Amino acid sequence: PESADLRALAKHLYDSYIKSFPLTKAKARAILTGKTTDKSPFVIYDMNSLMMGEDKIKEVAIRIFQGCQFRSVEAVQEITEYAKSIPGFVNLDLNDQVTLLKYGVHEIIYTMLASLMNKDGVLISEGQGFMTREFLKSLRKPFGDFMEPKFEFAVKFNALELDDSDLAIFIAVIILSGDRPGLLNVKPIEDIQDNLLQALELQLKLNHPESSQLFAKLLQKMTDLRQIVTEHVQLLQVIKKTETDMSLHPLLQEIYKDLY
Amino acid sequence: PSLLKKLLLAP
Numbered sequence A: 001p002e003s004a005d006l007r008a009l010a011k012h013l014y015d016s017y018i019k020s021f022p023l024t025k026a027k028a029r030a031i032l033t034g035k036t037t038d039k040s041p042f043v044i045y046d047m048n049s050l051m052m053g054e055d056k057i058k059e060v061a062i063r064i065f066q067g068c069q070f071r072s073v074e075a076v077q078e079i080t081e082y083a084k085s086i087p088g089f090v091n092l093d094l095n096d097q098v099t100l101l102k103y104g105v106h107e108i109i110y111t112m113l114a115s116l117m118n119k120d121g122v123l124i125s126e127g128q129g130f131m132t133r134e135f136l137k138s139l140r141k142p143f144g145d146f147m148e149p150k151f152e153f154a155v156k157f158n159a160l161e162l163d164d165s166d167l168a169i170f171i172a173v174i175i176l177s178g179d180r181p182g183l184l185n186v187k188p189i190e191d192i193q194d195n196l197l198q199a200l201e202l203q204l205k206l207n208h209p210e211s212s213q214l215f216a217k218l219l220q221k222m223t224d225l226r227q228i229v230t231e232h233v234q235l236l237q238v239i240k241k242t243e244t245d246m247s248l249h250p251l252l253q254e255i256y257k258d259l260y
Numbered sequence B: 001p002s003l004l005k006k007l008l009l010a011p
């Protein structure tokens, strides 16, 4: 039946998600809450602790920013691999595939970053380190204002209590957005997204039966993420313009170039 | 050619 196929699709996406993303929300929360056996993360909450934990994980502000860039580059590659596992994606016009990633990657980065965050900090280096929110927020401008927004979003988003199975479909829906600027063949993308949306709706009804409002809220989160990324790109163009001798990774420059 | 295209084409 149709519903059975939607569950098979949900499972396929989850399995692909597990193969593409090393640190899942399940693994991350197991570390944050402290219900694991492996070596706990090294905590970085100030300049001194940062110096000490360099092996466990330019001025500090710049150094931290460059760290985020490196992780972002790795993240873009993971998301690209995941995108290629979504049924129908690799058959789309190649330029449209590029467009979908260009406009979707940062929205997915914000989404997935929340999985590794709590109200007090973020897991880094595959969970081997933990950098406090207060430490990142205390960074001199315009870097401190660059870190906080991700936490503000995480706190709100994590209140939805989604699990990895939910996230796999949510992320797929976001990537297959037929309204991204410059797409050439819209219908094939919209058709794939329509099916992914049906899969997401069923996933939420079965996995969160006591939260009827979840689907509608997630649709709104997809809309919020666009405004969120817009501000992200802006705060970044400011840094690349006000912070001299700043090095922006080629992959990131390509994604940001000519972005709405 | 772009970096995103290269990543997308890598089997």
Ligand SMILES: CCc1ccc2ccccc2c1CNC(=O)c1c(OC)cc(O)c2c1OC1=CC(O)=C(C(C)=O)C(=O)[C@]12C
Binding pocket: A057, A063, A064, A066, A067, A068, A069, A070, A071, A072, A075, A109, A113, A122, A123, A124, A125, A131, A136, A146, A147, A148, A150, A151
């Ligand atoms: C996805 C990147 C991103 C974007 C925005 C964020 C906003 C707030 C918190 C984390 C954010 C992150 C994730 N950020 C990180 O994962 C992150 C980080 O966050 C503060 C600090 C940091 O020090 C590093 C991070 O990841 C790193 C990989 C490297 O290659 C580094 C080397 C060897 O130099 C680093 O320096 C590491 C260890």
